[PDB]
Design a protein around this ligand. Structure first.
Ligand SMILES: Nc1ncnc2c1ncn2[C@@H]1O[C@H](COP(=O)(O)OP(=O)(O)O)[C@@H](O)[C@H]1O
Ligand SMILES: Nc1ncnc2c1ncn2[C@@H]1O[C@H](COP(=O)(O)OP(=O)(O)O)[C@@H](O)[C@H]1O
Ligand SMILES: Nc1ncnc2c1ncn2[C@@H]1O[C@H](COP(=O)(O)OP(=O)(O)O)[C@@H](O)[C@H]1O
Ligand SMILES: Nc1ncnc2c1ncn2[C@@H]1O[C@H](COP(=O)(O)OP(=O)(O)O)[C@@H](O)[C@H]1O
Lengths: 435, 436, 81, 443, 442
């Protein structure tokens, strides 16, 4: 019914109108300063005026960096594009890593188009082509349960009708703008012409033939880039069996990108499209090579770069691809000048207890007070994530004993059955052969 | 169905557990390891509840302690219609897929969607077929008589049914299945009429039948991407599917579950020998577990404090600490004499080998002395030596002959270590000549 | 510029025998959807595309005579073969 | 007369009915316990019950491990599939090594199916197509049906074809007066040749002339075929054989090794199990032989650990000549025979032994009598002392230069002087190394 | 034609008792290696044994490649001699084992017997019937000799061979049935009414008399690898020239081996094995050696000749040192022919032979000074100096190389020892291994 995966108690940053953060509101406890800096950054993103802004948020493990980025994504809303990423995904065997970085950059700039859906649907009653051999037009009469309606048609739609093998008495679907024709099936009133036939019979549509609807299309710049750069050719609407040649990702030329920008600016100037810049989030940024770190310098200086958020938990660590370069957070000194660093602090006992109580609430479990104190002491003794992961086997062991509330004994059995990293390392050290 | 000679884990039909999740000492082919079986039963209940996602557990212990046996027990206790993907650590190092892409495909293969649909079918035995042609043969008329054990009817055929019956010849007395809406007709066989062989169907002839489909997320991911068809599910060249189709599939699956047209069935992904992954794979696995559509990942490893791949330092279990922070660890232990002899007796029963008591005691002694797998390999090779002397029961002499013929680890190291001039060393030096 | 045909007729390549044939030959995997004629129509159109299957072989000669002389269809309007 | 290369004096293990090895049998000399263990392995393979059984042949160089594997293959017979392989074969530039290992695993399992074929054949008498009413309508083809009249010995049938069979018939370039062969399982057409009922001396196309096929036109014949599981997987992954455009375009593309998914393997296994349940097919498991197993990487060994636990795996035979040697792909793991300790647990090691002077002498005797050469007794003693002094193989391949030097002196006898000349003209590893050490510029 | 490095060696220079002459057939000296190479040559010519590895070792500039070329020239026609280097195995589209398998299979020739029919005569009438599009083609040909005249039937390929290489009535053509080749021999009718479209000046040949159709037996040698490439896919004959034969499967090789044995069992074909020569074999990975050790034990295996000029050096793919750069398993199954350095008289004879091949009239004292500078420096330097001395000598317009032109060529062009002497005293001018250099002269 309802699923829960390490989050979803995080609903937002939990700030007031002045930008100040409350203590326990929005699923966040603690960390006022990082939440307020992130709210300032959300305001900067909503301003929609700057490009190439890079934020790094740094701290220890299990401090709340990914929860903060998720709170940014929930505070911006579903309209703004958000592209989460891990730094290991930039290495591919098809294209170079810089091209993958360019695609992930252009995936974070979105567009909004307002369009109208117009649909004719009903049973075919008349299909009369006529010669102007080349037909000039065809007249199609459609019938539904609320009346009938006749239409003139261009010969291209008649060609598409002849593709679908449409006869008199078939229920068809016509879209006015695109010109797509779909054959639903033969109508139900013609079902007793034979006792056995290979035709499916569908009833009449109970609405009108004409249907009108206003819709919004949300696309990004990368969709237009990959739609304009198909190497094999334009695919048809339906291809159940595959293409004869395998299309592989290619190095998209910047001339195509500037043509896409020119066409998008032309459509924006006519009031059709709306530009929505978004957020590109790269988790585990220390797993990037130095060449991607160099390409990020030029990629942040474009006119349509999004807001880039990076996270790291390393200290004074050697940069990957180098051997004698030691830099903070694994981020090279040439790139570390360009960002603003948000510090993230570790937690106390009461914050850990409140996090455990919130996670027990969202997972629909009841715990006792003494079980909560034991779980808080275990969380301060081993790690915060251990108690959160151990919460659900406690509920299972309480369920198997025909009870609904977790007590100290279930916590003791769950601690006995499953270990943490420290006790496993202690067993690993005092062992003869391979544990 | 499911052809198989004899597997090494063929005796495990599940986890031997009570209704209160307590492990019996001997049930379903599993003996010993009470705490590990209880932990795996708790994990099985976690999977069967289906309300939580993206939890990783680790099964660590010494070699030959029943970790793969535990994984096979969980997989057999899940049963059918629940996805279970088992991969090795060296499988993802592809030449046409990136490592994160292969891990993503293995992640989405372990979660499925249950779709229930109904279709109307025709089943019966053909009595008599008439095809009529006109003077010119422009139109075709036809009549088909078909019966079950309860009714009989005659149908008037149109042109496309007549063309579908002339193709894939259907004669009298054949039992066929007809789909009206798609036009596909399959020959089930021939009826029992001497005057393949199946029985005549019973009941009604027009049956509405419900078929419950289960399709993984990776299949809909391949079909929704236009870059390749559904034949890439069998040929295996999908080639780095883009992310945007995965967000479209995620949103479509979410609204399908909201409307009630589908249900989400999460499963288990099992990664055997997890220590052979790079640190980039571990870092992707760290952040791939917080997704809403993520299975429960089981990892098994047997290393101590060893070097993590792609790095220059050493870590416990071969895994970094940030991955170990999000894991709950199940520990397996070594076996006793009685557990070893019970394992060997069960392997005797599955291999259809009848053993003497003294042969079983000698196998238990040499299994405690050397290895469990060595005795479990010796038991099947002793039966051929016994059958060369034309007797059924395996005695002590056959076990001693097999122990003489086939060596083990420590003995082979011992004969190598004082004959190393005849073997090729690390420096590539060897002496082939007998003298000098 | 004709090395290949000279190597073809130098080594008598139009009288050699075939040495290898495959063991198993199979059609593509059938996709089944229960209760939809549109899937059958699309699959039959993809497997037996008339342009493509017409392109991979010829037209009979008397049929071409029936196109060109008895029906007045020019040669440039033929489906190419 | 015949051609011989380093083997083919070995015709089997040469055991008794009880499994006891004779001293000289099947071209084998000595190695009695290894031959008895190999006979037990042969009986285990012929039992056809076990899956994923692995043995290891461990010994020094020139101790007869490849000879024992060849004897295993000769004792099992040509019905059981035997797949010889070196360790360097698994490194392919087209696909990953794991897929190559699994491909050889599925190639080591055989099958035997009795297949029924629906066959039309005869001499083409009348070939008349019928036209469509609107051939440029865009959909639908140019013709509608083609009437084909075939005749045989005591039989004549007229067939009405759909266009799709006629496209294959036209691709086969048939005419009136040709003997054709239509099979109905896949629509494949074979054109046999011109019928002999007409003149055969007025052609320029170097074609052969066959008579009419006996029997009727429409037949159903039984054919017994021997295939492997890898053939089914390869035929399903790259589909050729249908008459659809995907199948015809599949033959024209350049072939390439792909990563066959597990879903296709499970479906092929399900189809094969359904065939076996009908009494049509039978299963013949076989042997995969991997030589120089120390050339494998740690990843291939780790995948072998999982591939041996499958329920359809064959019997795997490995061989190595290594002592305490670091595994390739690791820097500190020292293991016996270059094989990691996780694989040695799933193994049964068969140890081979070095030879004696008399065994060297009689091995040289069989190698001389196989190469159709006769030697003297003193030359044989010189060759046996030489084989003990330097190597068995160096004494083995010094026989042919001795025979050539005997032939060039118009004699059919190999004497001591010819062996001395072969020593003077050809060196071994030890004398070449001794020349290399006492050299000016790497002579 | 053009002059190569070993253009003076055509043969091995051996008697009927396999004893080398002191100076014969372009080869002088090196008696033991020449005798061993003659033994290996007769070993190849017998064709009874397979998969024998021969190693040739010695110092540089000794005659190892000269020995290999002498073996190849004494091998004769229609016997395959594949000469490769060790660096060509590493490819981007082929594995090393697959490239070695193809190099092994290139060295085995199959001699196929074929039965043909030859037709020659004047053309009386050509009738060609074609479709409207032009795909289906058929027709009749009326050829005629002095005594007989028959009418034949034509197919698509025969009409294609008739249309190109335009044949009219009155031309004399020769047709081979099994090869499908049409050659026009000339014209005999001398037609009066010629449409002036072409500038043909066809030869006047006589009427062929006698039998119209004559049979003959022809023999051609094909390689094994060509049969695998032809049977591999639909257009493998193009891949025989473009080299796009990517990783041919094992089933093709098994079926080709079976059909080759079947053709041998009937008498249509016979197997002629050859020599595979691997120069600089030390430039190979250890996986290549492990494959070679087991590919030498097959039935279809040629005799492999390897050359090395390397001592106890590092084996590639490993971290230890081995004799000749080769592992001991490969050295176990090899017999070794060693080569020794030269004398002054042998060097003088080498330079005189190379001067005779390059057509240079050397003086006596010029030859003595060339021998002196070829015994202090290497042989190849004094061999290279001869053409330069000749080109200096034609500047003075005399066709005889004196010692002055040789001295001028020695002054103008340097040896390796003079080059390292000049480099080692001016180390600031050249770029150091640390990348430091001095460009300014002050
Ligand atoms: N201030 C907070 N309030 C509530 N939950 C938190 C807070 N900080 C962290 N968490 C929880 O801790 C878990 C792990 O934190 P995470 O975002 O992974 O930190 P990091 O990314 O730095 O390792 C998440 O499930 C998150 O819900
Ligand atoms: N508790 C157990 N009950 C039954 N069989 C077992 C048990 N433990 C191990 N085995 C058997 O021992 C054999 C080797 O154990 P395995 O699980 O491969 O070791 P590992 O855990 O190192 O993979 C397997 O065939 C397995 O079936
Ligand atoms: N018992 C034997 N009888 C006869 N010939 C043998 C025997 N053992 C080895 N040989 C020969 O000695 C050589 C050993 O080669 P091989 O077995 O390939 O190497 P290894 O012993 O290292 O596996 C082969 O040519 C084989 O013919
Ligand atoms: N015995 C010989 N007869 C003729 N030419 C020789 C002889 N020995 C050496 N040469 C010449 O000396 C050169 C030797 O170089 P080469 O044989 O290529 O390398 P290596 O001697 O190192 O094997 C060749 O150009 C060859 O022409």
């Amino acid at each position: 019914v309802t699923r829960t995966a390490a989050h979803t108690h995080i609903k937002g940053l939990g700030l007031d109108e002045s930008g100040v953060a409350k203590r326990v509101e929005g699923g966040f406890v603690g960390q006022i300063e990082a939440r307020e800096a992130c709210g300032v950054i959300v305001d900067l993103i909503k301003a929609k005026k700057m490009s190439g802004r890079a934020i790094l948020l740094a701290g220890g493990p299990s401090t709340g960096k990914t929860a903060l980025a998720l709170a940014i994504s929930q505070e911006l809303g579903p309209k703004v594009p958000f592209c989460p990423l891990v730094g290991s995904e930039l290495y591919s065997v098809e294209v170079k890593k810089t091209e993958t970085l360019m695609e992930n950059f252009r995936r974070a700039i979105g567009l909004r188009i307002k369009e109208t859906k117009e649909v004719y649907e009903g049973e075919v009653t008349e299909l009369t082509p006529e010669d102007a051999k080349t037909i000039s037009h065809v007249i199609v009469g459609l019938k539904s349960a609320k009346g009938t309606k006749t239409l003139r048609l261009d010969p291209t739609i008649y060609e598409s009708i002849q593709r679908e093998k449409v006869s008199i008495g078939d229920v068809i679907y016509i879209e006015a703008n695109t010109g797509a024709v779909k054959r639903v099936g033969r109508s139900d009133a013609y079902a007793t012409e034979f006792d056995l036939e290979t035709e499916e019979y569908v009833p009449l549509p109970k609405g009108e033939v004409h249907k009108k609807k206003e819709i919004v299309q949300d696309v990004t710049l990368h969709d237009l880039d990959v739609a304009n750069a198909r190497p094999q050719g334009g695919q048809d609407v339906i291809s159940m069996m595959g293409q004869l040649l395998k299309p592989k990702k290619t190095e998209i030329t910047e001339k195509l990108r500037q043509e896409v920008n020119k066409v998008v600016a032309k459509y924006i100037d006519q009031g059709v499209a709306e530009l929505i810049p978004g957020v590109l989030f790269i988790d585990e940024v220390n797993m990037l090579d130095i060449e991607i770190f160099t390409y990020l310098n030029k990629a942040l200086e474009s006119n349509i770069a999004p807001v880039v958020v990076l996270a790291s938990n390393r200290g004074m660590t050697t940069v990957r691809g180098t051997e004698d370069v030691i830099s903070p957070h694994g981020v090279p000194p040439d790139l570390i000048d360009r960002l603003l660093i948000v510090r993230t602090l570790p937690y106390d006992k009461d914050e850990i207890r409140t996090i455990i109580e919130r996670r027990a609430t969202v997972e629909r479990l009841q715990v006792e007070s003494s079980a909560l104190d034991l779980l808080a002491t275990m969380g301060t003794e081993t790690s915060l994530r251990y108690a959160l992961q151990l919460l659900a086997p406690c509920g299972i062991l309480a369920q198997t004993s025909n009870r609904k509330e977790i007590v100290v004994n279930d916590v003791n059995e769950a601690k006995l059955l499953f270990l943490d990293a420290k006790r496993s390392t202690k067993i690993l050290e005092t062992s003869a052969n391979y544990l | 169905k499911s052809l198989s000679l004899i597997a090494a884990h063929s005796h495990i039909t599940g986890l031997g557990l009570d209704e209160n999740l307590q492990p019996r000492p001997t049930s379903e082919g599993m003996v010993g390891q009470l705490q590990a079986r209880r932990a795996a039963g708790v994990i099985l209940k976690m999977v069967q509840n289906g309300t939580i996602a993206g939890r990783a557990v680790l099964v660590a212990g010494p070699p030959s302690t029943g970790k793969t046996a535990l994984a096979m027990g969980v997989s057999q206790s899940l049963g059918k219609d629940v996805p279970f993907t088992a991969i090795a650590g060296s499988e993802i190092f592809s030449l046409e897929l990136s490592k994160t892409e292969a891990l993503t495909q293995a992640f989405r293969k372990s979660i499925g969607i249950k779709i229930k649909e109904e279709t109307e079918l025709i089943e019966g035995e053909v009595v008599e077929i008439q095809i009529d042609r006109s003077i010119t043969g422009g139109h075709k008329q036809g009549k088909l008589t078909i019966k079950t054990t309860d009714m009989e009817t005659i149908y008037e055929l149109g042109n496309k049914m007549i063309d579908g019956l002339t193709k894939e010849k259907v004669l009298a007395g054949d039992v066929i299945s007809i789909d009206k809406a798609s036009g596909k007709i399959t020959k089930l066989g021939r009826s029992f009429a001497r005057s393949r062989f199946v029985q005549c169907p019973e009941g009604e002839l027009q049956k509405r039948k419900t078929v419950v489909h289960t399709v993984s997320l990776h299949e809909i991911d391949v079909i929704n991407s236009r870059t390749q068809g559904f034949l890439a599910l069998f040929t295996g060249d999908t080639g780095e599917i883009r992310s945007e189709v995965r967000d479209q599939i995620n949103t479509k699956v979410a609204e399908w579950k909201e409307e009630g047209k589908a249900e989400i069935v999460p499963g288990v992904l099992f990664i055997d020998e997890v220590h052979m992954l790079d640190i980039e794979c571990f870092s992707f696995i760290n952040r791939a577990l917080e997704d809403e559509f993520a299975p429960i990942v089981m990892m098994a490893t047997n290393r101590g404090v060893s070097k993590t791949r792609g790095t220059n330092y050493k870590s416990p279990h071969g895994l970094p600490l940030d991955l170990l922070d999000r894991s709950i660890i199940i520990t397996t232990k070594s076996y006793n004499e009685q557990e070893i002899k019970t394992i060997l007796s069960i392997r005797a029963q599955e291999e259809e080998v009848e053993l003497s008591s003294d042969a079983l005691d000698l196998l238990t002694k040499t299994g405690v002395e050397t290895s469990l797998r060595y005795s479990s390999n010796l038991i099947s090779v002793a039966q051929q030596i016994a059958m060369k002397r034309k007797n059924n029961t395996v005695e002590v002499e056959d076990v001693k002959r097999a122990y003489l013929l086939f060596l083990d680890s420590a003995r082979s190291v011992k004969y190598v270590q004082e004959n190393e001039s005849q073997y090729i060393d690390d420096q590539g030096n060897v002496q082939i000549s007998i003298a000098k | 510029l004709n090395v290949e045909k000279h190597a073809y007729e130098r080594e008598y390549l139009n009288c050699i025998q075939r040495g290898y044939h495959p063991n198993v030959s199979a059609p593509p995997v059938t996709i089944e959807v229960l209760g939809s004629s549109h899937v059958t129509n699309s699959i039959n159109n993809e497997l037996f595309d008339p342009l493509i299957s017409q392109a991979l072989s010829d037209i009979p000669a008397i049929t071409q005579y029936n196109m060109h002389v008895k029906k007045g269809i020019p040669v440039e309007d033929f489906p190419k073969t």
